[PDB]
Amino acid sequence: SRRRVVITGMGMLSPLGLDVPSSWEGILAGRSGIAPIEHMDLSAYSTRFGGSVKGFNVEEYLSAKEARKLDLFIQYGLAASFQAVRDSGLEVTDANRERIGVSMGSGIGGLTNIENNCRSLFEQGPRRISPFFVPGSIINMVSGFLSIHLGLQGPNYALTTAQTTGTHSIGMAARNIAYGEADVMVAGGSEMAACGLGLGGFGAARALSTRNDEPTRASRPWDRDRDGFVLSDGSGALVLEELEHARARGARIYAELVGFGMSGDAFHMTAPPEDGAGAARCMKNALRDAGLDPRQVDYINAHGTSTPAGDIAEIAAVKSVFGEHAHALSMSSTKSMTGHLLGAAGAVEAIFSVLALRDQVAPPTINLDNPDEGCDLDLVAHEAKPRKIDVALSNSFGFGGTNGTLVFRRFA
């Protein structure tokens, strides 16, 4: 019979910091993590900036010998996972190791490593491909390497649902616990797509902002002068735990995960429908799953990518789901500051949604200077808004018309 699921630990690498508290301080202060990319020569690229993780030290987590074998997206996923497990206070024992699993996903996975090995292959021959190429690059190896390091023998898997990955990963890990396949899951996502193929490939789709001369203002969700998403790196991980398991060990509980929705648009490979029909269907599923009145929703962490079609589709979906209550809730895009962490977006944004509940504050949508036609909700323009938040919703929408919604509420 369906059990309740709470959040007992969180971990993060973002363009705003090397952990949760440092990231959250940047969020509440309206700070941009977006800057010209230093790690490669992008003079031939139409976009030369993004949200980099600054000063990441993998040797806070892993031996340099093991780190060298792993794509950055695996290193970021392990860092957030280790932080979340530590933050939980959970002790892994022979008694509980079979009941603790992991679902850390990625949208694109080890593109940097795949590019570097493709260069070796093409310039020098197959004998120069790394022996660690496959286990060092494939998406499931966050879950794999975390289980090996911590001794987690529960369900072990990874989702890849493009920009919806971190939201789906957390929702499905919550379903694992809810229906008794696990008592604890580490769940979230990680992404490092800032290589030639990543910036070049999104560039070739003309999906990215090209505001190279003012990167901190590039990400401007619902602003009339927005011109596409800002590519960002990092990771979010949460420890999800069955309520009575958490209560039994005296865990600190940040919030309860009460609702999860999925829906497919069945509309277009990359474009969202302008009326937000799939996102509305996904939110309604999530609110019904949480047994809520839609009027209980106080805060929405929007997908809010800063694309022309995506941002307006979300306003349409929120108006359609919430009717007059759409004018009472606060909705913000933290991508205004972090940029778009792709498969990690829904993981970091789930964490920001939990902290909005802990601290009773709506994070701002920075850069919202001139809201576009129809973008007339409370979008928390410019500055953080202290307010009552009992229920918070986090939305993600990705390529393939794939939608995810998570519903969190305060736990007393």
Add this chain to the structure above:
Amino acid sequence: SRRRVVITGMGMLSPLGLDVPSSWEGILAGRSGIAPIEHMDLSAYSTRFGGSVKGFNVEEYLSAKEARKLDLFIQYGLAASFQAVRDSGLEVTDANRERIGVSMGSGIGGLTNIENNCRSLFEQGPRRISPFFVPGSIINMVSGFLSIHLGLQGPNYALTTAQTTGTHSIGMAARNIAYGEADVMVAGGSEMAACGLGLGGFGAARALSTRNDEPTRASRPWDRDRDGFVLSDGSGALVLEELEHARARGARIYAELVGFGMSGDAFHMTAPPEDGAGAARCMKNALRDAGLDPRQVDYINAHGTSTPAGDIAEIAAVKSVFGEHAHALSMSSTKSMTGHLLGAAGAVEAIFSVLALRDQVAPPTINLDNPDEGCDLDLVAHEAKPRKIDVALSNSFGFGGTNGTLVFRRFA
């Protein structure tokens, strides 16, 4: 309680055939699909052979223009999915489309596309990268494109658990239906890693058989002369359906999906533990999920990759789980004929497990000329074995120590 899940449609591309009946005819005849890889200079490579899909015509499924946008692994996944939906007879309507979802996965995803776009990037720079590079290469686009083409609005996602992908996709899709989130799911996996990067990547780890002189004899699970797995391409898709839904429309039911097990080894990144402790937990989890005693199992489709460590771990696991029944069941590796389809292995082997139930026959382990030390189970050496099969297991054990088991039962 929980709804029952049945299989009403199946679809496949494999090295044996461009559909299920052709593939299955090859399986029961002990035919190898392994041959030197064509239209590709493998001179500098230690492995020059594998399981290719032969004579695949994508214009049976897609326009030339839509096919040009999509990696081969996506093409293969869509072909299996379209076959499976056709085979099921299901009519998608406005009344059921929100209850029909997709979970089609891949282990490695778009290596061929990444490789071809690397060529362009290194030679000519980023402005030659295809606009469809990202959506045409990411793993969730089989689910994406299938949902868009057929108007499916149910749960839309993609698993990526390396060589466990197909088994986990089908199992979690079955959970979706059992727990009322969907009435129908298309589930399985696809793979096309026969590029420089895949042959090169696995070859650099010396994981592949190098028996270039006799490719049809390379894949020889539990044989003392085995020297690693054989890389293979293709796809499997199953239509999963709630039982009352299938009966109401007069669906042809192949078999019932009664159990799903997951575990993590938490042991090593690429190698299983010698005693198969993880594979044992996973099978026991699957049988407990099915409410079945190990004694009720009649047929196991092994993971059976032809690796020294992998094959012996599976013998140890089966002896551990099944005790005095270990010899009574039949266990075969269809990878002896198909090679190792990686993320699609669990999908095509779920189909062969269902057809073993339909036709009351254990497929052979071909090339099992000299069983290794302790390989003394009924491994169905050389030739198919007609026998009673009421309960059939399909196991996958992949990188990161990720395990999956599906339990299928005869339906009457």
